[model samples]
Target: GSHMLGERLGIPAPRRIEAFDNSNIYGADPVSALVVFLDGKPAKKEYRKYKVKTVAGPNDYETMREVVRRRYTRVLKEGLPLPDLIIIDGGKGHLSAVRDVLENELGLDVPLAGLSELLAGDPPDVVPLDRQSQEFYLLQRIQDEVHRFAVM
Candidate 1:
């Protein structure tokens, strides 16, 4: 399933996939969640949450940027294994913010995909892939898990 997603995005096969989502209420303790998949299977132990620190109010874009920056910065500082792919929980606007932090600031070239009520990808304007294979459900699960974790 991960490979199918990689094929759709024209990237190398994705063995480790990570997705992100957020929950916030004005400036009242914003939080984010990360769900991990290893070999197309959920790696529950690897899932993470973020207590958003750098952003004020319920700003989804900045929240995404902050969490991605914080997560990858530590990943680099501690020499951790980077995921093969990233799927953010929002469309182009959120993906754009994350790219600045994940790619421009962090200098990591991981493939990026996005979800906007539906799965999407690097291109800003495109529909999600059909449920023609396991990867579609794979994406759906990741999105659902991240959202569930974030809101909880």
Candidate 2:
């Protein structure tokens, strides 16, 4: 949705976007993963997973913090190109956790946002989608794909 909104605002489609999701079952280990899309398509090879080292219980927010910290720490160490944008599959708490890690810990300059509205049954129309039909589809695909991978 932001991608479509960006297009309508005369901004270029994000060259690289990263989306992450976490899977947690009470009393079981949690897992998280980041999925990257390059030029509006899934960059399957860049996808990364974590066993959630820093959190033991079913805490999605902490799991998110760990996964995000690990991902970008590596990104900076390896001189990897930073993403144009970051999306988290969560609400306000999740957004806060990742933003803290990215901005406070890693000092990354990239923008971060989340799908809290979508998770709460809000429609994509709430986001300003102009004429970019496929951008909306791309967001759905990225969210679904990352969720599928994390839960699996």
Candidate 3:
């Protein structure tokens, strides 16, 4: 959604986009990966991976939330150029979890979205086709990149 919105507002099709995902065997030893895209292409030099910090039990969502918060906090401390979007790996629940930390804890203005794995349903389409904020295609790239990375 930000993509279309960005284009409409002349944001110049963001040159940097980052995606985050965690993978583990049965929720054991979870690992988080940050895949970066620069100027619409993968920039492996900027790629990052981490062993989940809060190793509780079988809670991927909690682990993911922790990593998301930690990552952004580091960015703030270092005063890095904030990303146009920070894409998460899961669906609505993932969005809700990260949003709580971002809003209540860090007070960031960065936009975020969750990439759902299930692609078979009638997508929960937002932004009416004729509305002023109708450009939601930018958000779709984040999902597409997540899917692309998972498959690779």
Candidate 4:
């Protein structure tokens, strides 16, 4: 939903944003991807793929936290322009994991959000307006997109 928040708030639209992903063959075979997008286009210049160190097995959440912490730490250290936003590829579970690292470890203010795939494909249906008291639809869209890219 954070992306949609950016979209609605018009917070620069992140002309170039990168996504981090992991695809593993098994417990020991783990692969990570830094998917890139530019002006809604794919710009591979920012793409980073990794075979992680200190990871003993396939734990997506821990690996995600570790990798993202490392990447942004360098950016923070070098004083590089942090990406306008960061997109993570899991839903609430992923969002919670990543947010803890960002808020606790990195101490950065870059906005972040999580997307889950269940929104894109056939799932259950409900009226978004009825599910109010907060801005969830906004989040639903962003989480949906993350899920789309990660799983699809």
Whose lDDT is greatest here? 1
List model 4 lDDT by residue over 30-102, tens digit each. Answer: 5566665655555545666566754645456787888888888898899976776676665566667777888
Off by over 4 Å in 3: 1-12, 25-28, 53-55, 116-152
lDDT tens per residue, model 2, 1-152: 44673464335567888887664423266566678888887888888766665465556677788778888898899998998778777777677777778878999867665652432111112345433476667777787777666644
lDDT of 3 by residue, 64-141 (tens): 778878788898999976777566667666677777787788897556655523211123223233333334444455
Give candidate 4 regions above 4 Å deviation: 1-5, 8-12, 25-28, 53-59, 116-152
The candidates, ranked best first by TM-score, are 1, 2, 3, 4
Supply candidate 4's per-residue lDDT for 55.
Answer: 62
RMSD in angstroms between candidate 4 and the native structure over all alpha carbons:
7.6
Minimum summed lDDT over a 10-residue window in model 3 is located at 116-125
Model 1 residue 150 distance off true place after TM-score fit, in angstroms: 5.9
Best by TM-score: 1
> Which residue pairs show collisions in model 2?
none
The parts of candidate 1 lying over 4 Å away from their true place are 24-28, 54-58, 116-123, 147-152
Clash count for each candidate, listed in order shown? 0, 0, 3, 4
Better structure of 2 and 3 per lDDT: 2
Sequence-dependent TM-score of model 3? 0.66
Which 10 consecutive positions of candidate 1 have the poorest summed lDDT?
Answer: 116-125
Clashing pairs in 3: 1-136, 1-139, 3-138
